[PDB]
Design a protein around this ligand. Sequence first.
Ligand code: HEM
Length: 182
Amino acid sequence: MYGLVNKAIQDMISKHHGEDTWEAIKQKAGLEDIDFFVGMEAYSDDVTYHLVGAASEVLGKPAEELLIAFGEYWVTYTSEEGYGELLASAGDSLPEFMENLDNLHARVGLSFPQLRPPAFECQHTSSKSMELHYQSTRCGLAPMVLGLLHGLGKRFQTKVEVTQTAFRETGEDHDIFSIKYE
Ligand code: HEM
């Protein structure tokens, strides 16, 4: 994943737990070499998985819990770190934003050549609910999607309830979330 993702994880941890904790995580993750992350540079996906595993051990939180928190954080981090207009352009309500997500990542992918974005498809079931299909080249990031959706709820001052109804882990084709919103 691009350095931007790893910087945001670093930022989230460093802000909540301080630099010493960050340095321990960095060390345990096997990254003491890397002096800083470069936002627009591509890293091995392993860098991100190791950082998360190491943060889990050092902080004593399951990795999935940290992914949820990171998902929520990302919505705020991107708005403040160069992508606030891009976010605004993706809509002014939760359901519209989710319809625009693939288009938003298409736009991101202009600037980030090697992007491997997720694919999201919405099947609306009412004016207050939708099924969200999430497909990815990567494993284990469904909890991050959960936090993202909650971050977007906060963004749009909209109450949202998100329940995953299909899990790749149980052998399903892809993750599916049932979403209800104000
Ligand atoms: C303007 C705001 C955003 C920017 C700049 C951005 C950019 C990125 C970047 C660089 C990656 C890494 C992919 C790679 O390195 O190949 C990524 C991944 C991801 N993004 Fe976005 N993103 C934004 C908003 C969102 C939002 C709002 C969501 C909410 C659903 C989202 C969902 C995801 C997920 C689930 C991944 C994990 C990659 C995967 O599943 O394969 N992104 N995004």
